[PDB]
Design a protein around this ligand. Sequence first.
Ligand SMILES: C/C(=C\P(=O)(O)O)C(=O)O
Ligand SMILES: C/C(=C\P(=O)(O)O)C(=O)O
Ligand SMILES: C/C(=C\P(=O)(O)O)C(=O)O
Ligand SMILES: C/C(=C\P(=O)(O)O)C(=O)O
Ligand SMILES: [Mn+2]
Ligand SMILES: [Mn+2]
Ligand SMILES: [Mn+2]
Ligand SMILES: [Mn+2]
Lengths: 334, 334, 333, 333
Amino acid sequence: KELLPPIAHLYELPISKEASGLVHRTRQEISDLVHGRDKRLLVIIGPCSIHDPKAALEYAERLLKLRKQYENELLIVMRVYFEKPRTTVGWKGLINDPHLDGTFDINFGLRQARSLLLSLNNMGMPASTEFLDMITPQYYADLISWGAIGARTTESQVHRELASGLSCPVGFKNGTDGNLKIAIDAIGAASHSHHFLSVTKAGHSAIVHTGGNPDCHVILRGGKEPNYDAEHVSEAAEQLRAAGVTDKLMIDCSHANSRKDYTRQMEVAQDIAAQLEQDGGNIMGVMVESHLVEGRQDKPEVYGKSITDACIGWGATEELLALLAGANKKRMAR
Amino acid sequence: KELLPPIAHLYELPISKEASGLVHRTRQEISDLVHGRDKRLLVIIGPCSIHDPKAALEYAERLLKLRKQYENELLIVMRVYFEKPRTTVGWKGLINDPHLDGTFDINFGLRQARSLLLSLNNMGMPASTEFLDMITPQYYADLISWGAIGARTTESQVHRELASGLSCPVGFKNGTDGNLKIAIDAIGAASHSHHFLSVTKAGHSAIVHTGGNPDCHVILRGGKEPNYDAEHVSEAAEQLRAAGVTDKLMIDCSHANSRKDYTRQMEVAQDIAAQLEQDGGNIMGVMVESHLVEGRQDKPEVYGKSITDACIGWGATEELLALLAGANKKRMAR
Amino acid sequence: ELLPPIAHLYELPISKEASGLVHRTRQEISDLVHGRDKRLLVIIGPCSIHDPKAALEYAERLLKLRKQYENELLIVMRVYFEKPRTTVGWKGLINDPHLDGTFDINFGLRQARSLLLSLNNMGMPASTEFLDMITPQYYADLISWGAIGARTTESQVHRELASGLSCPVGFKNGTDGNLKIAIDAIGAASHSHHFLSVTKAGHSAIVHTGGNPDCHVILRGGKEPNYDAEHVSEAAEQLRAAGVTDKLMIDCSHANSRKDYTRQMEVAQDIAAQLEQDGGNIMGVMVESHLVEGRQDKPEVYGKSITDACIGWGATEELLALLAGANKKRMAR
Amino acid sequence: ELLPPIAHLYELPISKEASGLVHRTRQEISDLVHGRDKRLLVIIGPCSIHDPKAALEYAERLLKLRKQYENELLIVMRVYFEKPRTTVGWKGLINDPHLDGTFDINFGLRQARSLLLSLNNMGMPASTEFLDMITPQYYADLISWGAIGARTTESQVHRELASGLSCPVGFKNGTDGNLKIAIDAIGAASHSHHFLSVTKAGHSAIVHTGGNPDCHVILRGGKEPNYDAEHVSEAAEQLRAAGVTDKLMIDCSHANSRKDYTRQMEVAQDIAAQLEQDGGNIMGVMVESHLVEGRQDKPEVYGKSITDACIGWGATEELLALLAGANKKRMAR
Ligand SMILES: C/C(=C\P(=O)(O)O)C(=O)O
Ligand SMILES: C/C(=C\P(=O)(O)O)C(=O)O
Ligand SMILES: C/C(=C\P(=O)(O)O)C(=O)O
Ligand SMILES: C/C(=C\P(=O)(O)O)C(=O)O
Ligand SMILES: [Mn+2]
Ligand SMILES: [Mn+2]
Ligand SMILES: [Mn+2]
Ligand SMILES: [Mn+2]
């Protein structure tokens, strides 16, 4: 079917001066955290997946007040995930199937994704996403301040290639059974120049030569056992230094680290707060799955409630952010 | 140099009637093995990587005689791997860097890949490869009788999507630390229809809708420990049946099953031969890394010797194939 | 970077109403071309579009007359986006929409399509000269009738283009008065051709056209004007000799008015007299008309041509009334 | 599907020798166009190429004379791949290379590029009429001189094309004899244009050309022939009035021979007499020549035109010897 090239969307939705400045400055600010120049905590927080732009904008408006309130302690960036990896089969996200009905209206999905990202940046909320697909990034990447390569794709050479040409900092996740070495290896790969095939803004395949991404880091997201605690952070930092890459890392509160209880995210955050208060020198960030309303649902019946992984709700989000701000204020003073 | 689209190569190197027939029949023959309709053993055998077409053709000519000799017991298909996944960085194969000098002459690489595959199929030798890149398959897939998705990419949704649209049977490998469930999950994914972005024969990005691949199976290739033995095969078969997919599987002699020691492939093959002789009902295939000359080398100084993973040499190859043919002859008679 | 036709089609898909109007107008014109209906096709409007707002106001006025005269006249607006220059100069709204030498062709194509969609949606079918080879994929679906210009009628690439258009096409006599090139052009464009063109996705491709069975000639003057009965009669003889339709269109403007917009009425009066006496070979006329008469070098005055001089709105009413009255009589015979 | 230019360029890259010949020939011709050298450019060869074998044999014979006469004549072969028809008919080797209505354009472009590369590699530069808008990207790098035809000289899209070509371009007078269209064409093509075209990758794009400073006119007859001293003198006055080069080319064939190949020699003799008397405004001639004289509808006889009738090889030797002798005298004055 009849795919519009990136230039069609760029024409309708050009990046504004304000969005461009926010992206540029947020990428910079994050690089500073990755390389230990600033001790604020990056907080990648928001829905597991975007399925409704209206709810995402309402969430963003609430989060913006806290982004501002905590700006001396936290760098808050919203989760705006358009692409979802499934264990076998399922809904792959807003771009692949925006109408949530198996119509796969990808032209509409890319348009809606770009539109939402532009609105978010224009209101002052920077955005993050997982880069899963090889061809979709040309459509919206200019609006992304931080990227994840997922646990299921961190070992993949084509994903490492992709990351090597992205202009935002990138977090590589440990593997789904807990293998951290694949993410450490991934920084090594993505930091170098690569030559590979990719698709241009005009929608044509081409040979690209990337310059390498100097702003990669790992993310601890659990495996067979969770890996959030001080012992695990310390072990990861040793391995990072041994490989000659940044020993500043991010901890995902959700997924394998919270296991089967989405409310465990608060426990993980409390453990992280305690680390920050004792020492926590190797922590530069955290990820939290948060929405307007807690939990999850198979069908999009309740407004502001995840249709993918379960999330904490708004009230818990306030507590979690206050907790982390208070703890990091102390780390920063020390 | 701009990227030539698939149609340029197809124009210069159209598939012949003979090649087309060999591919069609070999794919069918393999499907029969995958689904338990024939008890011959698929043997995916040849170099770790192709770096010299002249040596590959000489290898193929030798292997053809054994392909014919053993055709009632074994279905022999050559390893013709053009794309290599690296742990961090390194030579990614003949397509990416055909001159082996960091010039990345991908147009020449794709041409040379297609030319070699056409010559192989024309001489009567079917071909196999790992499908790693998303855009390169349109150049040569029509000449491939069996595909692998690698241990490092089996969990990747974009690779499962790719496999779902391939016209050849596909083997998914267990993960690098030994996780089999990701390959079982991968069959589940790739057997279904997907919608995703891909590039057309004219070199333009497009939305593709695949029909699913009914001929996927798993490959046991070792993890932290090898997984070739009867116990492991039996456990894998139970898990396959539980997931409702084919419980016929393939066993890689090389890689983590030989602990990266080419001299151990024969031991693995002997264990497999013993399984076939005792029962071995769930085995439909094996993989072997084999070349004209054993071992490996960093620079392509010695003719017919691998520059990637170490391989057994031609003499050991004869013993290994005779061993497997004799063992499977007995299984087939039972 | 040039956006492909599909980008514009996505933003501005043809509506059911526009699609029906185009389809039916093309049919109606085919009927005139082949002598099945005796209404007079009237291709009327600005020499060139340079301001969509004025074009929409003009269209709204013309629509009332299109409806009023529908039993005698088939009124279709001139919506010309591409202009052939003698040497160099402004080539039209698509090539340079901001009229300042910035050549914002993406904006120009968008604006052309948008205007054409709005016109068809309001009930006013559109005509244009097809000059460029690649631009038609952007808006052709919204055009009910096309012209191949005097300067391009003899060109094989223009005859190829016409052969694949889904609308009727008028070919003009050459700039010094040669009619045979337009007769030859019908011959060419009526047949199937294979040639290179660009797809809706913006890629070059081999196209195989089916031929255009609805082509006709247009008399637009040469060294001397050619609109009179004698000239029409001579043209019709030549058309029959070549085995093509002997129903033709007469341009009031250009070489036939000797570039004097005040003479278009005189030409129309001559045509009216032909229709009243006999005028069996006439199926249409062209008139260069705008809100305000004359022309100007710079787009200072609203609704006034920046290319060839046009008659104004008041003269347009008189001219259309004149032609409707004359053709009512022809049709009654 | 249509292969983009890059596919053909990959298989048939221009050689160093071909590249040098093209570069130097274009410069040599520019020198003639602007009156810096008094050699006579001779564009000579088949009306159309339909068989590459015969073209290469022709070229080998012509090369000897190219060399022999190099101090008096600059000989460039006619290698025409695109033909304008009066109505319908075979459009040339690119459009239908198998001459059977299969329209194998991919094969045609390949064969065109291959022949041009072989010709340049053997030392014979090439000329062609540029008719089609998309084909030139495939082979233009191998062309030393281009014609815009009589039927397309007035066409703005052809003037745009010429403005971006890297070779000198001759514009022909119109088919009824109008020279002003070609003079106007130089004015147009010498300026910068913006328009749509297709890239080497096969995608449509906006191009901005720099203008072509090496354009000139070609006298090719009209209703009457226009090759004589009086006509040359009158053309030169008009060229100076328009501020463009008053050095022109004279086509021996077409309407100057009244479509009679046996009259090309008479025209050449008239031109020779002009060169001997004065003939200061003449920089070139065109001649339709093949291995064997005449024409045929089907390609039955080897080396005989299937389009316009040509003189044969023997007559070609006489004609070249005549022009060399005459120009040797002009150059000595
Ligand atoms: C799938 C994912 C996280 P991971 O790649 O760690 O499983 C997510 O944020 O939804
Ligand atoms: C890298 C590879 C196999 P695996 O994907 O099991 O590591 C190979 O055949 O070279
Ligand atoms: C240039 C033109 C008409 P023609 O092609 O008869 O000169 C026009 O309608 O503006
Ligand atoms: C068609 C042509 C010349 P002209 O464009 O003067 O009619 C030719 O050389 O074949
Ligand atoms: Mn999640
Ligand atoms: Mn290997
Ligand atoms: Mn006009
Ligand atoms: Mn000719």
